[PDB]
Amino acid sequence: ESISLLELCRNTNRKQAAAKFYSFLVLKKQQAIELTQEEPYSDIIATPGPRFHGSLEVLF
């Protein structure tokens, strides 16, 4: 399972999309997810993390 940040922000405004971004940061800190960004300003991919064994679809 994986989640694209840019796809989660598809139909958002500036304040909403910033909050989805900030939430990847928080979730990463809690080790609910792992994070990949191939190069600056590319899409950011969330992958399952150690301290959460459910659905990424659930988390968001």
Next chain:
Amino acid sequence: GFLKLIEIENFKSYKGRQIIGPFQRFTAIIGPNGSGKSNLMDAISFVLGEKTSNLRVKTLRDLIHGAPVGKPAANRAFVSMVYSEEGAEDRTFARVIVGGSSEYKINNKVVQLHEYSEELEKLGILIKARNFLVFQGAVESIAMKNPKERTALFEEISRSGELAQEYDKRKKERFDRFNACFESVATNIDEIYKALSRNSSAQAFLGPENPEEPYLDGINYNCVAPGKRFRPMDNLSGGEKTVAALALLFAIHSYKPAPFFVLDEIDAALDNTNIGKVANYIKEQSTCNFQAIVISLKEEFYTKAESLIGVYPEQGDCVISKVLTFDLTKYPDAN
């Protein structure tokens, strides 16, 4: 004059080799509570020549990742700044930790710190004066200065206090320092206060007490808030007193202005009554007068940025920080 990116290798929690940016004209640095964000404040101060004692360590070597617990990740670490300039090639300024001592480099030329500082000075960056930096709580410190110490700050900036000893042992020079600095600050202060508080029914005035011997007496500062009558700044209350202090601080930095401005949690001192206002001011200024790099806690501030650099921690023996980049300009404006 543009800070294009920062490159870090094994500096504090920034383990390994990491690119920070590229920056836009208005970039905000954000993330959950941790040392990650302030360590990046420290990296900027470091590549701009800051003394070890202001970098929260006792020894240079301790800035190497892992070194505080005697588990250093490498024998060296560095911070590099890429400075870009239209019509010219990029210029890279690096400070490298080698042999427990700083090695300064400009485009792979090892240089003495004195030449490093001169070359930055030609770019408008004053690394002793730190014209590019607004440190945490700088707004509060400004807000609580009586006219005599408002002068004390000005002679610090204007080098009037430099000449203080040979003068008072006896003088045209000490005046030129103050007023060329002061009148510059006073020239711009009325427009900046009119811009922070959005309506033009605002006014702010900067007058010396000793109009032709100002280095001696205090400096008066009188405002005109909208829903108020003309009264000095000392007789202001909180929410609007802060906006008056911001105008003073920004006007100070608009004399000998740096090409970029690093604001370290300036939105800490802001309410829902003015945070959106100050944030639009920074946005408008970043299109022309200076590049803004802000470290911010409040969504109502950093959603005005064009770019977000978001800091996050990785698990390790030591705190590890990494960054993500996010473009906000692709999305519709909110309210």
